[PDB]
Amino acid sequence: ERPTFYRQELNKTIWEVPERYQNLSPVGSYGSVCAAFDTKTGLRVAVKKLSRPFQSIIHAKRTYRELRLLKHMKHENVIGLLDVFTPARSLEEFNDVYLVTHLMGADLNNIKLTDDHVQFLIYQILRGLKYIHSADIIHRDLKPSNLAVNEDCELKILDFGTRWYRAPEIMLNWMHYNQTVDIWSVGCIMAELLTGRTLFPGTDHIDQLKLILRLVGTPGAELLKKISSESARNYIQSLTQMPKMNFANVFIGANPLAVDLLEKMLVLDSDKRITAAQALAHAYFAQYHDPDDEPVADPYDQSFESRDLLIDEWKSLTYDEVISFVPP
Ligand SMILES: Nc1ccc2c(NCCc3ccccc3)nc(-c3ccc(N4CCOCC4)cc3)nc2c1
């Protein structure tokens, strides 16, 4: 059942892929990516050749992690795995991994948008996040360039886990953050789509926190009550007490429902931040929300993350995942 492969060089890089995929066009560079034509399905795909996937234990575990995540994602607003292949015929010669995904038109970084456009884009991000989060997965690095959009405005999240979109508790190095670090990111993205301007374009990590605190205000007593780190509490009590800004004044002219949702996403205290599922129910998405079509994910076994294995063992687990792959 093994297909016939064909070879070619692209940007000082040889590509060995099933004849199924045709007209490989480089799209730039973790991995080299080519645009291609899937003759089996008539669709345009992206083919990613991982670079040095098994170079070290850290790379090998990262390769396995990326394959396991992509094999799990089955949702309209999350990038899924169409195919995965290696030219190798055995574990012994297994050295290269190629991942095949839907070719998306552009990303949000390249795409000021109308409020109706922002509504539909953020709705789709949140629907994808509800699904990812329901599997106990956190994206951790959501940003416009990790959001693919086609000309129909259909959106998919990709490239799971720049400082401009990171939750303050990650900036301050909290070990026990929750899934709503991603909701902070969505809030930064949505703000940028509405205004045309990065919300918090910090020049470094200290400037980044200062910009965030200027908007959302310095932590309240209820939040300090929950801070364990001794420095963190002094640092918080030490810097100039900014007052929380009225978001309606900052996002002047925006739809009041958008301002209200932003207020619920950009909360400094992550215990109080809105979840993806809750945000889908916000009135801002009234014309798109469908509680019967915002599904959750099957459970995802992340137990491998806590394991310390040899480089060859991670490579063998990755090989098993290539062989066991079942296309959609
Ligand atoms: N229940 C909650 C809710 C929120 C929380 C939150 N939010 C970050 C708040 C913040 C305040 C000012 C500037 C940036 C972020 N932050 C931390 C937190 C932040 C940093 C640490 N450190 C890092 C230094 O080494 C000791 C451990 C430990 C805990 N806990 C929270 C617990």
Curated annotation (Swiss-Prot):
Subcellular location as annotated? Cytoplasm; Nucleus
* Annotated EC: 2.7.11.24
What GO biological process terms does the UniProt entry carry, in alphabetical order?
3'-UTR-mediated mRNA stabilization; angiogenesis; apoptotic process; bone development; cartilage condensation; cell morphogenesis; cell surface receptor protein serine/threonine kinase signaling pathway; cell surface receptor signaling pathway
According to its UniProt record, which reaction does this protein catalyse? L-seryl-[protein] + ATP = O-phospho-L-seryl-[protein] + ADP + H(+); L-threonyl-[protein] + ATP = O-phospho-L-threonyl-[protein] + ADP + H(+)
PTM per UniProt?
A: Dual phosphorylation can also be mediated by TAB1-mediated autophosphorylation. TCR engagement in T-cells also leads to Tyr-300 phosphorylation by ZAP70. Dephosphorylated and inactivated by DUPS1, DUSP10 and DUSP16. PPM1D also mediates dephosphorylation and inactivation of MAPK14.
Name positions with the PTM N6-acetyllysine: 48, 143
- Tissue/organ expression: Brain, heart, placenta, pancreas and skeletal muscle. Expressed to a lesser extent in lung, liver and kidney.
What is this protein for, i.e. what is its function?
A: Serine/threonine kinase which acts as an essential component of the MAP kinase signal transduction pathway. MAPK14 is one of the four p38 MAPKs which play an important role in the cascades of cellular responses evoked by extracellular stimuli such as pro-inflammatory cytokines or physical stress leading to direct activation of transcription factors. Accordingly, p38 MAPKs phosphorylate a broad range of proteins and it has been estimated that they may have approximately 200 to 300 substrates each.
Instruction: Report the domain remarks.
Output: The TXY motif contains the threonine and tyrosine residues whose phosphorylation activates the MAP kinases.
What is the designated name of this protein?
Mitogen-activated protein kinase 14
What is the organism of origin for this protein? Homo sapiens
The gene designation is MAPK14
